[PDB]
Amino acid sequence: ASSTNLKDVLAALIPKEQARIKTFRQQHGGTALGQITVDMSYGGMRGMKGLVYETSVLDPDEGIRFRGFSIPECQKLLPKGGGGEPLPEGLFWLLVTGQIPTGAQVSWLSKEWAKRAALPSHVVTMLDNFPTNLHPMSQLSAAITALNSESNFARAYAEGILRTKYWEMVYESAMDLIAKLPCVAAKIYRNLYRAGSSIGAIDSKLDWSHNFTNMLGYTDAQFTELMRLYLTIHSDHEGGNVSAHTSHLVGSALSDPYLSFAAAMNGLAGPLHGLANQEVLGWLAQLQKAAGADASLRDYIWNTLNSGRVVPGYGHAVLRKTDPRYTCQREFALKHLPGDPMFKLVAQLYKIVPNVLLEQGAAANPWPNVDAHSGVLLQYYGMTEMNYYTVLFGVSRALGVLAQLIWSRALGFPLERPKSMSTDGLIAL
Amino acid sequence: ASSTNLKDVLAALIPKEQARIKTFRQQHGGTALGQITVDMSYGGMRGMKGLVYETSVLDPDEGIRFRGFSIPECQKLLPKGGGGEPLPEGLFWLLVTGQIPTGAQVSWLSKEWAKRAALPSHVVTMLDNFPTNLHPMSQLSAAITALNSESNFARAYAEGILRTKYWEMVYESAMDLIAKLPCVAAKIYRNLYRAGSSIGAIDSKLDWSHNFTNMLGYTDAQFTELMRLYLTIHSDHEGGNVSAHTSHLVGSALSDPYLSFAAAMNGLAGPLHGLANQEVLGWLAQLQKAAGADASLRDYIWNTLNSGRVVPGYGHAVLRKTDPRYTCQREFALKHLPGDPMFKLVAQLYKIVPNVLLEQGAAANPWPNVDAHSGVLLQYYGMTEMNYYTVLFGVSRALGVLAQLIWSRALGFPLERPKSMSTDGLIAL
Ligand SMILES: CC(=O)SCCNC(=O)CCNC(=O)[C@H](O)C(C)(C)COP(=O)(O)OP(=O)(O)OC[C@H]1O[C@@H](n2cnc3c(N)ncnc32)[C@H](O)[C@@H]1OP(=O)(O)O
Ligand SMILES: CC(=O)SCCNC(=O)CCNC(=O)[C@H](O)C(C)(C)COP(=O)(O)OP(=O)(O)OC[C@H]1O[C@@H](n2cnc3c(N)ncnc32)[C@H](O)[C@@H]1OP(=O)(O)O
């Protein structure tokens, strides 16, 4: 009988996984995984194997994987609009379930996400009264924290549900959240950049990306394609990155998914993290302000380094090679905007930056990360409001942290609560 | 020459500490601190020595310490109003500097915090338009995220300051934040519980606690005393607790102190964490609803356990004994409200709960934690709005996470970014 239902699929999947994690632990719970050194402690857990996160695993050389699926692989296997880029909808099914979805499954997340899109009056209100000097990420985060009055897990909890059923409310929570995100995001864009206009409504027949672009006001067909790849590739990046790990950390205290995602964005918003999106553009904007020589480009990079700032869009805590997210973007540019000056500028830096970083001898990974290439793609299409870029990153990331949130709760993952130490204490240990 | 200035003290303190952490590492950076097992990974880092945090160290048996200062010790050594409880101001000086302040230093944080108290118009606005079904923690968090437009570190960063000077803007950031907190908190209270009234203004001559109580509208002299202990003992609890660790985690990406503190509250807001404050009261409220026998009390506890819920206010991830925060509160009650029925009820549970928890055989620590005792103290004084309790916890916690934030940045602590793994991956490792 019947038809598509992530939830019913999930219901078959949880017990097996549980069981499977049970014996594993019964047999290796005591196996040492690694060691912890002083340096790791002082170094922000660098190199520490500390979290279990399932939806994605990052390889230091090869880069991110969604099952064991690489970006190029997803590109090939996930369903497309009709027509080149992969639907973030399909990634999502993939992240939750471990399996490649059928277009028919994919069409289901679309409707579903379309059905759930709705904003409460208080939230709209707040967004409309916010000042234009309030950063876009700030507005996004305060808005999602403010949606928690709508929480199905928050409500269920207060009613006293048995802990075995958490995963069920979380899932509603997450589907509703994802569903709402674009409305919230577009409302910010519109208030800040298209004053007096309106987001309009969601069209049950479109895919999530395409309703987002409409609400953002973009008509360019290829722009929609950009959005679909963008939202897909920004999805997830294992659980130790600030944004994901934050969501995991807060979600672990039983704060609802709205509250964990909003904390997550306060993290995405850090310069060292997602804000790099925006930071690259400004730096590029500054560069061009002060078609240059490789050498003048180089004087430029040293000046940043010498000033005790970072070069944005370069380096990575885990990656040891060029981010396949960066390559992916590059290949998109070569097909669609190969003659763009900004693009050409990004291709040029690629030949200098890492060399300069190797020169300085401090960065462990001198290659570009995803942030180095995303904004140029956007700017080309007419979306030149750079302080807004990170919101896009936010909307995508929801796909991964929320898919995992549902698993944490399904698996009964407990309170994230490590032991801390002081310098005196350590010195004495 | 001259007079009091935390900042000038801090300026003398940073280089020494830096230097001191330099050689330490040069000599032990490679020393293994511990090991990581599968179980620890699956278990939310339980038992993992993973963070360096300086302001406070929690001993599993003896409980929290601010330098190496115990709660009873602070009680004795910190300056008081004039007249029994310790000023959260003095704790703060203590947390930042490692030293016991003089009343004259303490009077300085008071004025300082009084000088900096001010709310921007947009923030006030948002608070006034929020719905009454929007949880108090929600409102607090969206409000602090929304204050980030005022960030001195956010502004400085965008201007390109050298990384050596971060600690300086953070400190302004933190002093301004602490300073504002009570205004924000009281404005929420007032809107939600005293509609039509106003917070009134801050009096440069009072201490931080006493201006808070006034803005909250409480006149009881002993209530002020309660507040002063409360805000002091809730200050900090090492860095691995959700709230603190969150702030550390987000702050590590360079998000300003407003954004890190607001993420921190999304964490405090979890039932498993600070919300326990509130959870205890409701549970107590439910209990009394359905002067009882030890036995009926016991049937009551089993019913919670059997229902797959937690008993609130009991248990702890690190503590192995009764929280000295709990004892501290208990001793306050015995002096001031020994005949209170709710209090008597809390004393009774103390004789049953742990026994029942020992019975069940799942909790590692069956003793009460701070959350088990705080609300009864408040309720007694007429502050019976339990969904509000966690805000108080929030305002206090700022004292510790912000004091450490200033050190992280002063010490050049990098990006918190551990390695995650999947079950498949682990299974294969
Ligand atoms: C998408 C994500 O948010 S991740 C990347 C987005 N962020 C950026 O593009 C910002 C620039 N990048 C950086 O700040 C870093 O490369 C990070 C945060 C991505 C990685 O951090 P870490 O693991 O601590 O890097 P790494 O181990 O290479 O640091 C060694 C030294 O090189 C420096 N370094 C690394 N990347 C850079 C860079 N892009 N510009 C200048 N110096 C750099 C580090 O700051 C550090 O200096 P320090 O020892 O005085 O603190
Ligand atoms: C102030 C702070 O926020 S910390 C405490 C505030 N929180 C509370 O009072 C909520 C009740 N407490 C709890 O949920 C826990 O005792 C915590 C979160 C404080 C500690 O968490 P953990 O380190 O994971 O606890 P512990 O190791 O004892 O857990 C072992 C088992 O006992 C259970 N247990 C522990 N405390 C309780 C309690 N208060 N009621 C019922 N069962 C409990 C745990 O949930 C777990 O069950 P599980 O294996 O099916 O998941």
Overview of the molecule:
It is classed as oxo-acid-lyase. The entry lists the keywords OXO-acid-lyase. The assembly is dimeric. The entry is titled "structure of ternary complexes of citrate synthase with D-and L-malate: mechanistic implications". Two copies of one chain form a homodimer. With 429 residues, chain A is mainly alpha-helical. Chain A folds into two domains: 1-275 and 388-419, Citrate Synthase, domain 1; 276-387, Cytochrome P450-Terp, domain 2 (Cytochrome p450-Terp, domain 2, Orthogonal Bundle). Helix content of chain A is 59%, strand content 4%. Chain A is built from 20 helices and five strands. A two-stranded antiparallel sheet of chain A has the order 3-4. In chain A, β3 (57-59) and β4 form a beta hairpin. Chain A starts with 5 loop residues before the first helix and ends with a helix. β2 of chain A pairs parallel with β5 (419-421) of chain B, so a sheet runs across the interface. One acetyl coenzyme *A sits between chains A (46, 272-274, 276, 310-317, 362-365, 369-371) and B (412, 414-415). One acetyl coenzyme *A sits between chains B (46, 272-274, 276, 310-317, 362-365, 369-371) and A (412, 414-415).
